[PDB]
Design goal:
This is part of a larger assembly, with ten copies of chain A (192 residues). Chain A is of the alpha/beta class and 192 residues long. Chain A has one domain: Alpha-Beta Complex (2-enoyl-CoA Hydratase, Chain A, domain 1), CATH 3.90.226.10. Chain A has seven helices and ten strands. In chain A, strands 3, 4, 5, 6, 7, 9 and 10 form a seven-stranded mixed sheet that branches. A two-stranded antiparallel ribbon of chain A has the order 1-2. In chain A, helix 2 links the parallel strand 3 and strand 4. In chain A, helix 2 packs parallel to helix 3 and helix 5 crosses helix 6. The longest helix of chain A has 26 residues. Chain A is globular and about 70 Å long. Strand 9 of chain B pairs antiparallel with strand 8 of chain F, so a sheet runs across the interface. Chains A, B, C, D, E, F, G, H, I, J: Fourteen ClpP subunits assemble into 2 heptameric rings which stack back to back to give a disk-like structure with a central cavity, resembling the structure of eukaryotic proteasomes. Component of the ClpAP and ClpXP complexes. Chains A, B, C, D, E, F, G, H, I, J: It comes from Escherichia coli.
């Protein structure tokens, strides 16, 4: 049992699924670990599946991750915007870097976060080796990406673009109440 | 047979279950080994799944583990606070550091530890490399975390805050009877 | 549970399958990671299968990849052109190098990319060690490949051949709107 | 076929079991290899299960192991003392170190061993690196553990405490007949 | 199929088995490869299982092994002597060191070996690092084991003890006909 | 001959020196490569040696280095300020980081750099691992060092302190004419 | 020339020495880098030599070091106290840990440090692996050393012993003016 | 005898030094291997020495090298331009990259290469890892260097600046007669 | 100069020695670091030389070492006893294990240690791998050595053999005053 | 004594050289091992020296080498052709690849090889990794070198160019008599 089994009664009954498949059936998706290319692809397959199961119901995305590859993260971002039903994002543990970015991309009014969680934002990282000509080609591309990420932050948070520009210079840490004040989440969940 | 199978009679079976799934069905969750990021999500999934079947029934969380990532077993803390049932955290083997942090978080009156167990508590660890400017930023965040963990210990144990700060500067080991006097647990189980 | 299970009902029920088999059933194929031989072979097996299932219906190919081996990539390219149904290619995340090449190889009018994606193109890479005589042989072969790849780009994109040659000398990056104008894709998908 | 299958008939019949589950059914538990944390956790789960299936019958524990971690070994010990049915420990191969302390912890009168087996006992090991202040803290804790283990040995074997301390100064090896005379076991099994 | 499946014919039907479970049912156990604790732990479980199935029928042990750990080998030895039905040992390939020891331990009159097999016997190996005092303790224990193994060889083979002690000082190799004259086995199988 | 010998006549005409000893004699000291303790320890010995031979004459220090350990570099800085004769610093190749700092420390009016050289200046780097308490102690010390280095820059260059703080947050590169305008050096050498 | 030669005149003028023997002649000894046995063994030989050359004159010891082995360092300490002439210790760069200890041990009134230097002090470090008995022996010895080192600090600095104990619990950094006030050094040198 | 000794007679005839010092005496300096800081530092010392010996005579620099670090190479360049005597460069073997640059920097009318030599010229290489902000800073600096190197090539060769920029886009190889026609050297030496 | 040169005046005064050669002339031998064969072999050569120089004068041996190989050390032990002049041993830093043995082997009345030194003694270590027969041979030899070392300690220190036997079971540490009382040294040197 | 010293009489007789310097005086140069930049650089310095001492006398070059770097080897070739006195080459052991090339380059009528030697010739080796465009550039350069080396072989051996090209496609081995007929050498030395 790395992952335990659960049993559920329906019609015929029995029907024993996994501890994670049982939750996918409850329109629950978890995002954890680093955001890469093989894992992000699965998150997308799950969202497309749920969208085709019932276009009118929300999908809940639980976020707990330190960061990741911008490209992989953007495929998640765009699916989350394309599909018809709202995706409600919940931040538990941490949402840092690219994780924070995806957290704020949830449906407006449905961005929650648990009270002892942490959110951290910063500038995009990268690098390169090669001829001076190739160095200038790659340097311009990273700068364009940085600019694009800042615009999406301003769009989703309500902050001006310049305010976003200043707040991403160095690593910036926000407590759950600051995420609410700043505009990354709408509210803090407390008790059932 | 890394993990053995068991059988039980219900209605028209038979029906075999994992040596661990059989116990999840008994609302018993084990938390063993070092607290990571993948294991923590699995514990959370089990608690929610146990709060979906029957919300008016206690959930037992046996705990034997030497500690782990602070910000990833500080998301098993917030799921226990929030759910409807009572999580009565029994002790065995050891509960050190973050493990000793979760043990005291159980339902008041229901924190138990076996007589030959050990509980150890201490100040959180961390580190960083970079420009003097970045060092300052990261140093501030770890200090904020230290302060918050002390407040939660004082809250759950009944100790004054200053007493908690003094007692965690360097590792402190407590025997099962001292855990009871200190207030980390309510009682010691002996024999059935 | 790296990959979750899903349930569907038809006649008598049951017949549970994985999250990727469920989407293959909807004639959806995903292409991620590096393009190599063992993976390319699977993409081809899936396309041959779907053709046999229903020669008149479109096959959807999701493309999110950094590049890869040209030979492996060409087996995918030729299969797409050979089989009867149209293949509609959709870019999310990135389509770089060989990935970009396969993206433009989809059915005309059906090449779509999500709005925050990136496409990057460049001349082929290679190398060799050996006697001066062998070096000459291998250098000639890579140059022939470069020439052929450029002809196919001009054919599929509508650019002149000379324009294609100039544009692949150094890594060239295109944003989603640039890919549309250039002629690599027909359009940008927005919302369902 | 690392582990073979066996079958049995009851009512409906079949019942195809992995040979180790077939023996768990016969209230037989094996303890082999190093006494770590994951393995001990599994043994405890098996004992709780058997004590919940029939509180009035003995549970045999077959021991063949070189030693291990004290903390993990202690949760096994406490569970054996807590649960209602007698636990009878048999030791074939070797019972060394922590593997010998648990061998004597079985129900009095039911501590049989093998004829060619070996039992070895010794003082606990440990270590530490750090500031002189931290060294003191850790040195004190290991000494407390040594003292506690000596008390339990004297309690279960009938030896005086002073005799136990002298005998664990350096590794002591006992043959099966000596284990009987010393009081580690009650008797030697020979032929059925 | 690393290990192939086979089908039998009983009162019901189907009954599919592994290329090894099928033979366990015929009271055939194989001992191959190096003797160590996990493997030596599984063989004992199989022998206990077969005695219970039918106490009045022989168990066949097929031996092909280079040697191994004495402790692990002794738990097998004691089980063979304890259980009621005869255990008949057959040597194919090689029986060296501890393998040869177990070979001769079978039921008298039922020790066979194939025509081109090889048997090799020798005194035990070991070693130690530490203080002169610890060295003495461990040296004494290995010598006690050597003495015990020689007594058992003489007991099972009929050779005098002095003869066994002289013969095992250096590796001794015996061909199948010599194993018979020496007394390690009773006979050689040839053709059915 | 990694280093060639040179011949010079004085009185009797027999003198043969290592070319570097020949130049030490002409009050020329070279500083190249990383600044560390053993290397720095030798430069200080050379300056003290020259100060003793003739307290009234200048010492020429040739600088070509990427940076180094601040502590080691500070022992060069203090010796230069302490000893009686002027030390004139000349930058060839590069003077980065700590190298730049030592360059500006030369006697006022005598700081000179060659036409194609480069000078770089940035805030100090560092790091630590450990308990939150120790992290705080170490973070405070690096910040104090940074502040002291900035005061010394402002002192030697004539820039305001706030201007120095702004200019060192991120790596700042200056060409030889830029070093003159900024005040790091007084002038550029051209031709003898 | 890793180390340059210098020329000095006496009678004939036939003197060419290394960049260190020339200074040994001026009763100057340098201590740099880690303190360990071979390095320390050389410093002691140099002091004995100089003591014999002229028992009435001071020896200058330049210190620049991160710390080191206590035992090795104590052989320098005792020699400095045994030999007749005063040893004047000068701190440049840094004097950390054992380096600080040796710095304060110089002749009273002659302990000086340059203006931008740093001095750091802390309790001794160490460690051990072994049986609980050995751990106790080794723990006691390190604590005795801690005690003795503190007494010597109090003796040489004028601080009370209790003040010294409090100040060495955790790394304590002192700037040159703090070292003068505290009493580790007598004064700060400025300019010749 | 890695480097042999040679004998010459002057006055008393007692002259025996390493062959490389014998050639330094004849104002011949060799440059081989990668250009880097320590080796460059030594060449500069040799040129300064020879200038002092006789400011009116030519210095011959033998170049045979694959390239190297630009910063180090520039200190060689600036010294050659600064000192009084003409420096005549001779290329044998190869002068690639930075080696080619220094070759053309010799005195006009005195740049000569041997008949089977090769000269290579290309734009500078480099790279960086870090935040998008830091990447920009580093990318600008490498581009500034590229610009400066092109200006100096055009100055010394007589080519227009635009022609130099085109010719260094990718490695350009020149045979000895081509170097003469292009203007990198003035002539080819043939026979004494 | 890793090791500096010193100058002495005699007749002509044309004498330059490496500082260790200079001290050998003062009949001073240093013994530092681990005691092995190549180093021990040099200590012996030096003593034989000095014995020949003047059979009627003392030789001083400075000891600072963390033990070493007994066999190598015994060649120093026997040489010291064979040669005519007394050898006076002085302990600084530490004399551990074999180092302590050699320390007490000096001439009676002339064994002296500095006040902050440490002396540590323990039974010999060793080990072996092989056949039980070889293990016995090697175990006997180490025990004979232990016995012989115990006799020599008693002879040189004046302690009874039984007292020595008890005191070396576990590492025993002695402070300088304890070494004097115990009888390892005759006195403590303080000041010249 | 890796290289023995020899003594020779002249006038006063105070002459002691390394055996290799002794032979340099006899105008003998040895070329052994791989041809690389540093070794080639030394041979050139020796030939220039000998040319200066006496322009009218032959220089003898002993060749024993497996091959090496062409660029480095060509610098030897060009010096041999440039300097005034004839260079006579002698092959002993082997002259392979670049070694064979230099062997034939000696003065006509003076190329001699020993009877059991071997001479081996082949086309040049090389390689590259990079963009298809860079591969083309490097492939062209290696082919130009191949063409040039064949022309020089034809010039020195007297073979037609086509014959040289055919013979070097694959390694061709020649015995000393075969080298003579082919024209690589003029004759075979036998006895003094």
């Amino acid at each position: 049992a790395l992952v335990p089994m659960v049993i559920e009664q329906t019609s015929r009954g029995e029907r024993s699924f996994d501890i994670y498949s049982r939750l996918l059936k409850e329109r629950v998706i978890f995002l954890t670990g680093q955001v890469e290319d093989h894992m992000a692809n699965l998150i997308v397959a799950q969202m497309l599946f749920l969208e085709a199961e019932n276009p009118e119901k929300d999908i809940y995305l639980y976020i707990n991750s330190p960061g990741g590859v911008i490209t992989a993260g953007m495929s998640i971002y765009d699916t989350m915007q394309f599909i018809k039903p709202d995706v409600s994002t919940i931040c538990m543990g941490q949402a840092a870097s690219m994780g924070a970015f995806l957290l704020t991309a949830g449906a407006k009014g449905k961005r929650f976060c648990l009270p002892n969680s942490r959110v951290m934002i910063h500038q995009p990282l990268g690098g390169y080796q090669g001829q001076a000509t190739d160095i200038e080609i790659h340097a311009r591309e990273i700068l364009k990406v940085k600019g694009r990420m800042n615009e999406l932050m301003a769009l989703h948070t309500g902050q001006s673009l310049e305010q976003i520009e200043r707040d991403t210079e160095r690593d910036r840490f926000l407590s759950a109440p600051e995420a609410v004040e700043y505009g990354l989440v709408d509210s803090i969940l407390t008790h059932r």
